[PDB]
mmCIF file of C-alpha atoms in Angstrom:
data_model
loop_
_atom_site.group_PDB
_atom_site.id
_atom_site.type_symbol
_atom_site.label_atom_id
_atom_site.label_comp_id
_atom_site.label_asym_id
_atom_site.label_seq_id
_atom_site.Cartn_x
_atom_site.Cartn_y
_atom_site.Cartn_z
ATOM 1 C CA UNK A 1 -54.658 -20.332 -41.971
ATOM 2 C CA UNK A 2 -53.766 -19.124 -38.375
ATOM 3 C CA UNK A 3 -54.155 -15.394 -38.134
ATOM 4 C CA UNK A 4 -50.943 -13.534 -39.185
ATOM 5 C CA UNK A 5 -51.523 -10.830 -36.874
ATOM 6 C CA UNK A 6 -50.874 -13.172 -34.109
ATOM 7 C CA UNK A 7 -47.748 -14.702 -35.697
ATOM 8 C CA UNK A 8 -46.347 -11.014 -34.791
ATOM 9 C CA UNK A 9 -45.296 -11.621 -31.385
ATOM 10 C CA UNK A 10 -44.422 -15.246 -32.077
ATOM 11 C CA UNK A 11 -42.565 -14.282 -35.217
ATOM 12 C CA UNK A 12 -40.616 -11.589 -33.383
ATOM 13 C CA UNK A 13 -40.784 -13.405 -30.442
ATOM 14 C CA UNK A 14 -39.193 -16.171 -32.745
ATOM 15 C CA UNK A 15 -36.805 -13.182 -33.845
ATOM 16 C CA UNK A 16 -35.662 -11.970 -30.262
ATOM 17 C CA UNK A 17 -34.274 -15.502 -30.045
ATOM 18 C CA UNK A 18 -31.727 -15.814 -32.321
ATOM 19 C CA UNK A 19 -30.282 -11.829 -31.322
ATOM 20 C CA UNK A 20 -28.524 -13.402 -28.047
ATOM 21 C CA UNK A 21 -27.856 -16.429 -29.842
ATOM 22 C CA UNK A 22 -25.951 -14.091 -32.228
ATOM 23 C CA UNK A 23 -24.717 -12.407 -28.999
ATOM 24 C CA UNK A 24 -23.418 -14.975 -27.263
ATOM 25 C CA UNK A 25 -21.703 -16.440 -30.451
ATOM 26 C CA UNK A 26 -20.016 -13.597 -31.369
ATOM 27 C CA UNK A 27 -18.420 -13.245 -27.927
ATOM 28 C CA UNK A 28 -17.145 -16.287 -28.048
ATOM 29 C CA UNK A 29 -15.239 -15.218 -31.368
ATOM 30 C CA UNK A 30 -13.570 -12.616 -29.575
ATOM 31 C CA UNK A 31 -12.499 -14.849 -26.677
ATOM 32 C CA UNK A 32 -10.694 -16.699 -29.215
ATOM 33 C CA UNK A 33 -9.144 -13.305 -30.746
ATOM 34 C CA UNK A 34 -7.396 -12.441 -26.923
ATOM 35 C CA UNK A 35 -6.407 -15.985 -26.595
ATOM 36 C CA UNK A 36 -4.314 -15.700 -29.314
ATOM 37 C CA UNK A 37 -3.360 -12.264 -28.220
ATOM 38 C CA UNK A 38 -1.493 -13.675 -25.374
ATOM 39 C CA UNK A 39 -0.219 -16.769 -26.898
ATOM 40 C CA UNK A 40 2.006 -14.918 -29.087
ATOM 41 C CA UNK A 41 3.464 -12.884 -26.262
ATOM 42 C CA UNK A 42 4.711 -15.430 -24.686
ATOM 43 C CA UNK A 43 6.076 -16.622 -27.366
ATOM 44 C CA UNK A 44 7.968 -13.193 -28.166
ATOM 45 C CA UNK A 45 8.759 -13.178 -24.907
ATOM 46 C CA UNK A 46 10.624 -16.655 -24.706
ATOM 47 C CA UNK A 47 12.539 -15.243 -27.967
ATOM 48 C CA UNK A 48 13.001 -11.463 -25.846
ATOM 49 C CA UNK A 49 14.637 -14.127 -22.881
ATOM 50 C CA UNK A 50 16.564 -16.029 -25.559
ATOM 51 C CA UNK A 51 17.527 -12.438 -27.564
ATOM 52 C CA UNK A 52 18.915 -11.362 -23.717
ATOM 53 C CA UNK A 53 20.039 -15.000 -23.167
ATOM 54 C CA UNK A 54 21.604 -14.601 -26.624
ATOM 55 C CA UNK A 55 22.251 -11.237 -26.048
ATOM 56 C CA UNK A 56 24.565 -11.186 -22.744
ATOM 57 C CA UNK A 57 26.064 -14.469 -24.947
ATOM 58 C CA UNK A 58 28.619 -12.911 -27.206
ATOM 59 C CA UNK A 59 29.779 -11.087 -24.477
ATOM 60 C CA UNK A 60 33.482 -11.662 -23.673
ATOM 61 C CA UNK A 61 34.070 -12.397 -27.423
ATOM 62 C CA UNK A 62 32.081 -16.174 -26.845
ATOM 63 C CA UNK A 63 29.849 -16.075 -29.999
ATOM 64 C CA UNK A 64 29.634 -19.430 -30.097
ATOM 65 C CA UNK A 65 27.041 -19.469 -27.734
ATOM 66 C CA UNK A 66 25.336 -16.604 -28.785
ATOM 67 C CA UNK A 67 25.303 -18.725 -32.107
ATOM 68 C CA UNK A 68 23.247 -21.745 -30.860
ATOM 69 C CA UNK A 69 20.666 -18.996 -29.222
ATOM 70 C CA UNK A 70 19.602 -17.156 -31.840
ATOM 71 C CA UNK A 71 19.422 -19.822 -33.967
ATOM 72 C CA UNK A 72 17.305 -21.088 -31.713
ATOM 73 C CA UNK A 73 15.660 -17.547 -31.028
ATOM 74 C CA UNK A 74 14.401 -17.543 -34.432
ATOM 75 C CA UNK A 75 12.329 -20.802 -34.220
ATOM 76 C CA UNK A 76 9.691 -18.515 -32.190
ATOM 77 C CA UNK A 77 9.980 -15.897 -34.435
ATOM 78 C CA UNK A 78 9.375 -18.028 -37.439
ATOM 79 C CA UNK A 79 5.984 -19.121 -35.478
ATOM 80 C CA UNK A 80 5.847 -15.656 -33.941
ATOM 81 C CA UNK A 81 5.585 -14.020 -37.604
ATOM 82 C CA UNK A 82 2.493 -16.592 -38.443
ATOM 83 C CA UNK A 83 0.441 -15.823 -35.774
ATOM 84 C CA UNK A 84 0.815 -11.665 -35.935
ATOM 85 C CA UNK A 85 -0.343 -12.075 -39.768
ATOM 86 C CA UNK A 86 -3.240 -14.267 -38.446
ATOM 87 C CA UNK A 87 -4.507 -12.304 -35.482
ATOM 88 C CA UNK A 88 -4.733 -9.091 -38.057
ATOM 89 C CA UNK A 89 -6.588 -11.159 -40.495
ATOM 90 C CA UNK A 90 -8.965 -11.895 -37.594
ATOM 91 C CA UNK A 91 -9.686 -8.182 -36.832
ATOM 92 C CA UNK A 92 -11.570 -6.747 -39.850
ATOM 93 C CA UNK A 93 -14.174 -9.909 -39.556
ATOM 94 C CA UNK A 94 -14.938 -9.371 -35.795
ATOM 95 C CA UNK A 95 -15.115 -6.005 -36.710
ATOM 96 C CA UNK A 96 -17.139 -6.599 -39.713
ATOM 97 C CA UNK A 97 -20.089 -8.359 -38.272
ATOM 98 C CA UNK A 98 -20.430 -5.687 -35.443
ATOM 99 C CA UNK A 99 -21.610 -3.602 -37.629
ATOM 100 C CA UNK A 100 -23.569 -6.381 -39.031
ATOM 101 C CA UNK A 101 -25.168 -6.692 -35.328
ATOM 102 C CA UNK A 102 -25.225 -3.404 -34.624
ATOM 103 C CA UNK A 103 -27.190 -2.125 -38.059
ATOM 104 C CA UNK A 104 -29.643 -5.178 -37.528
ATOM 105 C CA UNK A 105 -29.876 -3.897 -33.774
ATOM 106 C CA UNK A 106 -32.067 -0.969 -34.885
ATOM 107 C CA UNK A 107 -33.522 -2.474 -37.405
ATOM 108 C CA UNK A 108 -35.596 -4.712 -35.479
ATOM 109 C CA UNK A 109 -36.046 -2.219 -32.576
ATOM 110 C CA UNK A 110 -37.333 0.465 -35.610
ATOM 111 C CA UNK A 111 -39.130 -2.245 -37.254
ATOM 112 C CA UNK A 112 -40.827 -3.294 -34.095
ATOM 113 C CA UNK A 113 -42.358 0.455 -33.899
ATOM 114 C CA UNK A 114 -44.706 0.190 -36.370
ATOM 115 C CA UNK A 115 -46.175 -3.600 -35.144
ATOM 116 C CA UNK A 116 -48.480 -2.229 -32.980
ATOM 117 C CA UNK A 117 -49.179 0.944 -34.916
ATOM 118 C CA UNK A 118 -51.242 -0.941 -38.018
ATOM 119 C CA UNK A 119 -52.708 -3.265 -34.991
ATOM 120 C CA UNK A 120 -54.080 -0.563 -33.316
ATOM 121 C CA UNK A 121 -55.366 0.690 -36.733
ATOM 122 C CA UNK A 122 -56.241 -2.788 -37.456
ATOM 123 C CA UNK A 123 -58.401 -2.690 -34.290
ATOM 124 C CA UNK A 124 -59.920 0.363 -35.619
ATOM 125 C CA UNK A 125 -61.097 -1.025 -38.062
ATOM 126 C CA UNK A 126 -62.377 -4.362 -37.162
ATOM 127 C CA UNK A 127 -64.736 -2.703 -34.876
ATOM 128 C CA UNK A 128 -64.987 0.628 -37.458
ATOM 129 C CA UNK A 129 -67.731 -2.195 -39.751
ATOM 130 C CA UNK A 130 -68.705 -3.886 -36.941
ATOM 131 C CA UNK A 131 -70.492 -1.188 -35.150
ATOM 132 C CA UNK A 132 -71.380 0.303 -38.460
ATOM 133 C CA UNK A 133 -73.536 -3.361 -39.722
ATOM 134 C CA UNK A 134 -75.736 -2.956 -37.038
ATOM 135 C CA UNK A 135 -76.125 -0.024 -38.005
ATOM 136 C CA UNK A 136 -78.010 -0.866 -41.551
ATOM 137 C CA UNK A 137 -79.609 -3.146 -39.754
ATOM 138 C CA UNK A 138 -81.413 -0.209 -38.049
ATOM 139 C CA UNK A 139 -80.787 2.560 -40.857
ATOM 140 C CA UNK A 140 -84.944 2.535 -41.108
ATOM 141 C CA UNK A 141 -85.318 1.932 -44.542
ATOM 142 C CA UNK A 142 -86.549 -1.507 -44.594
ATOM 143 C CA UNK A 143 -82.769 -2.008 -45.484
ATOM 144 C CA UNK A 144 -82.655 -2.274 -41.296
ATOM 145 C CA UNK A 145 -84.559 -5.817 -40.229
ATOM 146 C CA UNK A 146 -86.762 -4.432 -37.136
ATOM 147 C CA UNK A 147 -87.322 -0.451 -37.784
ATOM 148 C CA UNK A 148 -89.705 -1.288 -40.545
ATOM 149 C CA UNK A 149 -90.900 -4.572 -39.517
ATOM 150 C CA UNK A 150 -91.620 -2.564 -36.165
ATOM 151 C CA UNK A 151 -93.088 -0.009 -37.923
ATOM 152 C CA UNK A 152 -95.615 -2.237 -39.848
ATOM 153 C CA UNK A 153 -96.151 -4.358 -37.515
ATOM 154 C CA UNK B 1 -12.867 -16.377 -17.666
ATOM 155 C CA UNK B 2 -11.879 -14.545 -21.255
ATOM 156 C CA UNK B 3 -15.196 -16.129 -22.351
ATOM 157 C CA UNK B 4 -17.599 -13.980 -20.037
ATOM 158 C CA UNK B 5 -14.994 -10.689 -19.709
ATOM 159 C CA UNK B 6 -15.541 -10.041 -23.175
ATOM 160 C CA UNK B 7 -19.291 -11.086 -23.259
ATOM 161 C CA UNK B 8 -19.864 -8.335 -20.776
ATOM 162 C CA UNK B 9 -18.013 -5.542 -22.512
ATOM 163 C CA UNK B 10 -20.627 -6.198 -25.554
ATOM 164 C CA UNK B 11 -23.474 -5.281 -23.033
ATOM 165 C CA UNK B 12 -21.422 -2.457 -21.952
ATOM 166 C CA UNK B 13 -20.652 -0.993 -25.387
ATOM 167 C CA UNK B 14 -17.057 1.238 -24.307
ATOM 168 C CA UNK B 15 -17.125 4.745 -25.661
ATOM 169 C CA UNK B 16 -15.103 5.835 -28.908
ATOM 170 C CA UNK B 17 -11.902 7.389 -28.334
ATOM 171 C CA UNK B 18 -13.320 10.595 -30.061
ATOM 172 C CA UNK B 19 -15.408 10.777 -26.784
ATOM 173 C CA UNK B 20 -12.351 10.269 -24.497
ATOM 174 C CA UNK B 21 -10.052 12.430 -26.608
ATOM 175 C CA UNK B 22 -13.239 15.473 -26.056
ATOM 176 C CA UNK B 23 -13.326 14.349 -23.130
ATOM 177 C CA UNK B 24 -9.583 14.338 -21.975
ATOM 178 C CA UNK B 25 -8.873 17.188 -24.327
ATOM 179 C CA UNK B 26 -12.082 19.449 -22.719
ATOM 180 C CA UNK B 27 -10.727 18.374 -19.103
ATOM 181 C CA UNK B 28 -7.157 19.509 -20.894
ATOM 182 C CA UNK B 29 -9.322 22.778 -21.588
ATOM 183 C CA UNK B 30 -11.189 22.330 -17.980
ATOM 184 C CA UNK B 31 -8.233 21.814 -15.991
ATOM 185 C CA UNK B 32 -6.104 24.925 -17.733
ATOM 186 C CA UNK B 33 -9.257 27.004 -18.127
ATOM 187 C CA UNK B 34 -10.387 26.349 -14.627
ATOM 188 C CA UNK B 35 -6.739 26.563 -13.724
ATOM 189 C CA UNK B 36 -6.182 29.930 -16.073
ATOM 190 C CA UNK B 37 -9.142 31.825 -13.662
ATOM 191 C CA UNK B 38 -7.026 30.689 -10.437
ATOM 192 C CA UNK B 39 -3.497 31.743 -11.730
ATOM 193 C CA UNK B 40 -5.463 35.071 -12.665
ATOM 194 C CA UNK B 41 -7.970 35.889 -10.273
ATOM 195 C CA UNK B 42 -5.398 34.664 -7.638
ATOM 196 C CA UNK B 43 -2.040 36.000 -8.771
ATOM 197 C CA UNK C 1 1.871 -32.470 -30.792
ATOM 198 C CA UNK C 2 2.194 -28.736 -32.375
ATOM 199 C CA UNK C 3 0.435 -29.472 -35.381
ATOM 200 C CA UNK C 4 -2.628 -30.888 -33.116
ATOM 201 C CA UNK C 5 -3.177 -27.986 -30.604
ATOM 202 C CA UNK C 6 -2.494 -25.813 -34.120
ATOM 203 C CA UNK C 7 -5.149 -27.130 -36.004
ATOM 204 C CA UNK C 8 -7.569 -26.838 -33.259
ATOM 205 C CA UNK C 9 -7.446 -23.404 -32.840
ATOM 206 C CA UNK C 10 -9.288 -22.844 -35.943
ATOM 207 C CA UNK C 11 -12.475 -25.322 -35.098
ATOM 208 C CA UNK C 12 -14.038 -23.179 -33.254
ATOM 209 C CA UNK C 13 -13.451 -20.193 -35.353
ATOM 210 C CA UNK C 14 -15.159 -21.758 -38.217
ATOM 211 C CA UNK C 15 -17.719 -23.093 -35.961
ATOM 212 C CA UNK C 16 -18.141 -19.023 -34.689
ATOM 213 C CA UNK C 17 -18.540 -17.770 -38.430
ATOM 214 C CA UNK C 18 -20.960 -20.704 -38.997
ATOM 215 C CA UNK C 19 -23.248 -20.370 -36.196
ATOM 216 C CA UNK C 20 -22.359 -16.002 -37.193
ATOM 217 C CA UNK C 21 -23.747 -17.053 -40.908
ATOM 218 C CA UNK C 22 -26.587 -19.502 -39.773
ATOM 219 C CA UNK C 23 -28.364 -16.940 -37.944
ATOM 220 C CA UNK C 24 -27.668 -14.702 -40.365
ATOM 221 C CA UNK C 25 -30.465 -15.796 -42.784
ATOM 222 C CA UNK C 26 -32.437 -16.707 -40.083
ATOM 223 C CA UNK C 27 -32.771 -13.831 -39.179
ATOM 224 C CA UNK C 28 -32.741 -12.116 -42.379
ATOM 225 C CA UNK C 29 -35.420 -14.595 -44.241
ATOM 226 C CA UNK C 30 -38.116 -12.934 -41.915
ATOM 227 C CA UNK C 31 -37.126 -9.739 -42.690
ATOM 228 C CA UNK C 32 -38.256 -10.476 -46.318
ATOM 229 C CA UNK C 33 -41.324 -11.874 -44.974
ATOM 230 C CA UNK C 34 -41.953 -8.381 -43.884
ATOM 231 C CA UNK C 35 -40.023 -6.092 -46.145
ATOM 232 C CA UNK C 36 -43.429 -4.845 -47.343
ATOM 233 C CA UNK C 37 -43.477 -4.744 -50.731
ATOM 234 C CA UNK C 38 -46.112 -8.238 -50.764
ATOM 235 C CA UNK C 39 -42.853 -9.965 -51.382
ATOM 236 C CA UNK C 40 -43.600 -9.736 -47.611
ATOM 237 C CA UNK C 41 -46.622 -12.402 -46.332
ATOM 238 C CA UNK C 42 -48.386 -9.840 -44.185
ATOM 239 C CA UNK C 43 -48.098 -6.592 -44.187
ATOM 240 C CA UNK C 44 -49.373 -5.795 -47.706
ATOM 241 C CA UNK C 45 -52.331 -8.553 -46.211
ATOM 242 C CA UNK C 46 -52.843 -6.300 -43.257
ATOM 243 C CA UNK C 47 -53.030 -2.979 -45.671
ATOM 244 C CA UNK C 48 -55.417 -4.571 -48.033
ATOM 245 C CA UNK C 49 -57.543 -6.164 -45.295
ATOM 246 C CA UNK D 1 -16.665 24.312 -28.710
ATOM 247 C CA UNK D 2 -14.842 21.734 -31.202
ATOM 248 C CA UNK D 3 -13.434 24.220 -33.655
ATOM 249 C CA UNK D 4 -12.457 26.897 -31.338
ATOM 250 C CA UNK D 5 -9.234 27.542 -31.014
ATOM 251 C CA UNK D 6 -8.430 26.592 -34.345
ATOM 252 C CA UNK D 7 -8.918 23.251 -34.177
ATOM 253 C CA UNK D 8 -11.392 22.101 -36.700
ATOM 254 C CA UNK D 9 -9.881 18.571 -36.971
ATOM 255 C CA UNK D 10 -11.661 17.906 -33.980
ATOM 256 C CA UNK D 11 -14.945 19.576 -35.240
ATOM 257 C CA UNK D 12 -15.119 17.911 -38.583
ATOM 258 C CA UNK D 13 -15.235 14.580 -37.056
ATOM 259 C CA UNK D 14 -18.431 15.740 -34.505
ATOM 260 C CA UNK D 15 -20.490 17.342 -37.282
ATOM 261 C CA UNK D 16 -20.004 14.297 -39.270
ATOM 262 C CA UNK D 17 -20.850 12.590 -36.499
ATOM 263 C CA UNK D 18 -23.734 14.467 -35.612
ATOM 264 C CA UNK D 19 -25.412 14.048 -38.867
ATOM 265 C CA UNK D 20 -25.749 10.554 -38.142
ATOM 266 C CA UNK D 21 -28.636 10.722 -35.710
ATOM 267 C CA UNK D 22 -29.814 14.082 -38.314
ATOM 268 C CA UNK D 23 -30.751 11.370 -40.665
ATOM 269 C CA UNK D 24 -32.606 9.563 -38.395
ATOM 270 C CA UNK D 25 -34.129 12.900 -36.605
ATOM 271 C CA UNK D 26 -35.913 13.689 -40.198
ATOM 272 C CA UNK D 27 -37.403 10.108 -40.737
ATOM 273 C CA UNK D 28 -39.158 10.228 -37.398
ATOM 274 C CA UNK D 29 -40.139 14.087 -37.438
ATOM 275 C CA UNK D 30 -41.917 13.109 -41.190
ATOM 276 C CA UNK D 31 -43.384 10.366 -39.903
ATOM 277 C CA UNK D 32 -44.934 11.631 -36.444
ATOM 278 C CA UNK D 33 -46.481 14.326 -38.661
ATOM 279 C CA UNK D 34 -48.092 12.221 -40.900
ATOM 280 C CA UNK D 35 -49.469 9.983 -37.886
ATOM 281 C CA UNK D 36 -51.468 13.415 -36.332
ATOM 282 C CA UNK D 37 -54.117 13.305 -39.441
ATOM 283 C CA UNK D 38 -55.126 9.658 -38.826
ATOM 284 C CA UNK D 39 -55.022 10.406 -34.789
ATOM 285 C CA UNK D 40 -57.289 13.108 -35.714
ATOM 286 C CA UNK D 41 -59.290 11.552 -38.652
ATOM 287 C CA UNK D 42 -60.053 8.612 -36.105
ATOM 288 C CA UNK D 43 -61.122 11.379 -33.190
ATOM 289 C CA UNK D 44 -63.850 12.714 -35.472
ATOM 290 C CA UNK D 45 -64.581 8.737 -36.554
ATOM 291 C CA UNK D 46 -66.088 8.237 -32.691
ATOM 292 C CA UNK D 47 -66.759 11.685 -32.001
ATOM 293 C CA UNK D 48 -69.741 11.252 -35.009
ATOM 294 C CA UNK D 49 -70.417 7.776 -33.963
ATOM 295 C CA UNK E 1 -4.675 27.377 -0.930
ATOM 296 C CA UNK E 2 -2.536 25.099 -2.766
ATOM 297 C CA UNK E 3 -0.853 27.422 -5.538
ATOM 298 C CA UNK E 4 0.445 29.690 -2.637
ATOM 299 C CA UNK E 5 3.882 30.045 -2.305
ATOM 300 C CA UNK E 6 4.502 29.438 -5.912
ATOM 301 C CA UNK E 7 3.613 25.766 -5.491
ATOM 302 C CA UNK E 8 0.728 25.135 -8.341
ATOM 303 C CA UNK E 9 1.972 21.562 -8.829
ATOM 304 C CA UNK E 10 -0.353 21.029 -5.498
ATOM 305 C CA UNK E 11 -3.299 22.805 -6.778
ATOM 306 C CA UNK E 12 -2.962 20.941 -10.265
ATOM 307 C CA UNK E 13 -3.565 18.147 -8.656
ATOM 308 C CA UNK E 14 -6.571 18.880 -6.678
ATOM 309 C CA UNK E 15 -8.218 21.163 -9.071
ATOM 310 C CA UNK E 16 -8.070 18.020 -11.351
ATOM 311 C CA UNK E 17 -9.212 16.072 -8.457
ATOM 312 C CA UNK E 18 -12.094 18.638 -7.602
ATOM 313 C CA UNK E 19 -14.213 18.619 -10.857
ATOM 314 C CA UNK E 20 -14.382 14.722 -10.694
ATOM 315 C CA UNK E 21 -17.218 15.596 -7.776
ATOM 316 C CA UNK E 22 -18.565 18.646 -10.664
ATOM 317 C CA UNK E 23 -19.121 16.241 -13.097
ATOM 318 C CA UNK E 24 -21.158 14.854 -11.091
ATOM 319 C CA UNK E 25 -22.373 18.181 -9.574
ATOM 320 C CA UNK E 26 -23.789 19.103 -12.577
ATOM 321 C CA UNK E 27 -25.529 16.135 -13.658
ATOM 322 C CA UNK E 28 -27.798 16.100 -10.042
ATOM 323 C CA UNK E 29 -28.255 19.926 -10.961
ATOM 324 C CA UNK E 30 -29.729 19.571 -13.895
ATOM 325 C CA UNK E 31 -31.968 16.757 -12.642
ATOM 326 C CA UNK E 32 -33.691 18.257 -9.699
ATOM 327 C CA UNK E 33 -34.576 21.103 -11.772
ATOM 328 C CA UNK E 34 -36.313 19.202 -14.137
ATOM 329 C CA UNK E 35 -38.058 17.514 -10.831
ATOM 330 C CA UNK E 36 -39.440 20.615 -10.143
ATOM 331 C CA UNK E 37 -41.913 20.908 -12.785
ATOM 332 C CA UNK E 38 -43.272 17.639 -12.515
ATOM 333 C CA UNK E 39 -44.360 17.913 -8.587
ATOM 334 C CA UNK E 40 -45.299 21.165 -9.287
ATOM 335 C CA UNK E 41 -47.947 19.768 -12.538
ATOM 336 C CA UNK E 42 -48.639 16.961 -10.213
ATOM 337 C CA UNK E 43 -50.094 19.458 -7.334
ATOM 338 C CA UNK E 44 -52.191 21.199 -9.409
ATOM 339 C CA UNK E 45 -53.672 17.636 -10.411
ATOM 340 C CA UNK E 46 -54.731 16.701 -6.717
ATOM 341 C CA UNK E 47 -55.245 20.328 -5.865
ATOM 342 C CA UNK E 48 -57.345 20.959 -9.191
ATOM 343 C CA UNK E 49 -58.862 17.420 -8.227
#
C-alpha cells in the first residue's frame, strides 16, 4: 500500500478543495436570499403606490374607485405575505451552516497543527534505528560483523 | 453582481454589532470624555 | 407565467443545500479517517509504527 | 471598562465572550507544555549519539 | 478654538472628526515601539558577529 504519510498532503490537499467549493456554494445561497429581498419590495411598493393610488381615491366621497384599488392592492399583499414567511424561513439555514463552516474552519486549520508534528517525530524515528543498526553492527561483541572479524583476523 | 458582492463580504467577515455598539458607545464615552476635559479645562 | 418564474426560484436553492450537504460528508468522511481512535486509518498506524 | 458606569449589560456579554478564546488558550498552553519534554528528551537523544 | 463663544456644536464636530486620525495615531505608536527592539537585537547580532 502507498505510504499513508504521504497521503497527508494529498488527503488535505484533497480536503482544501472542497472548503472553497463549500465557499463559493454557500455564497451563492445568499445571493438568492437578497434577490428575494428586493423582489418583495417592489412588490410592497406597487401595493404602497396602489394604497396612495387607493388612498387619494376615496377622496371627494368617490369610493368607488378606491374600491377597485384595494381590491386590487391586496393581490400583492396576498403574494407579499408568502414571500415575507419564506425569506424568514430562509434565514436560520444560511445562518445555520455558517456556523457549520465556520466550526469546521478551525477544525481543519487545528487539525492541520499536529500533521507535521508526528512527521517530524516520525522522522525521528526512522533515522532514531537507523543510525542505531549500524551501530550493533559495530557494538564489538561479535554481535557487530567487522570489529571481531577485524579483530581475529 | 449580487453573486460576487456577497461572495466578498464572506472573505471579509463584518464585525458583530457588540463591536460597533463598544465601539460607538466608547467613541460616545471618547467624544464626551474627550469633550468633558475641553468644557473643563477650557471653561 | 407566475407559476413558472415561481417554481424556479427554488431550483437553485435545493441545488445550494445539495451541493451544502454533498460536501458535507465529504468532507466529514475524512475526518473519521483521522479522528484517531484507529477508527481512523493512520494515525493510530503512525503511533504504533 | 464594560461595567463601569453601571453598565454590566454590556460587560456580561464581553466576559462571556472572552471565555471563548479562554477555552482554547488552556488547550494550547497544556499542550505546548507537554511538547517541551519530547523537545528535550530528543536534545539529549543526539546530544549522546 | 471652536467651543469659544459658546459655540461647542463646532468643536463637537471636529473633536469627533480629530480622533478618526488618533485611532490611527495610536495604532503606528504602538508599532514603532515594538520596532525598536527588534533593530536594536538585530545590531547586537552583526555587531556581536
Amino acid at each position: 500500500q502507498e505510504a499513508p504519510e504521504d497521503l497527508l498532503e494529498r488527503l488535505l490537499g484533497e480536503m482544501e478543495l472542497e472548503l472553497i467549493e463549500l465557499r463559493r456554494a454557500l455564497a451563492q445561497t445568499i445571493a438568492t436570499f437578497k434577490s428575494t429581498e428586493r423582489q418583495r419590495d417592489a412588490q410592497q411598493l406597487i401595493a404602497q403606490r396602489w394604497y396612495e393610488k387607493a388612498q387619494a381615491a376615496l377622496d371627494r366621497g368617490n369610493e368607488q374607485l378606491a374600491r377597485e384599488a384595494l381590491g386590487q392592492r391586496q393581490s400583492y399583499q396576498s403574494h407579499t405575505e408568502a414571500l415575507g414567511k419564506s425569506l424568514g424561513e430562509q434565514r436560520a439555514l444560511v445562518e445555520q451552516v455558517r456556523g457549520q463552516l465556520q466550526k469546521l474552519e478551525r477544525k481543519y486549520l487545528e487539525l492541520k497543527s499536529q500533521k507535521n508534528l508526528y512527521l517530524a517525530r516520525l522522522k525521528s524515528a526512522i533515522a532514531a534505528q537507523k543510525i542505531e543498526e549500524i551501530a550493533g553492527n559495530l557494538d564489538n561483541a561479535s554481535a557487530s560483523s567487522l570489529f571481531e572479524r577485524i579483530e581475529t583476523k | 453582481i449580487l453573486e460576487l458582492e456577497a461572495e466578498r463580504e464572506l472573505l471579509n467577515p463584518p464585525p458583530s454589532p457588540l463591536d460597533k455598539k463598544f465601539e460607538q458607545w466608547e467613541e460616545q464615552q471618547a467624544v464626551e470624555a474627550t469633550l468633558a476635559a475641553m468644557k473643563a479645562r477650557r471653561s
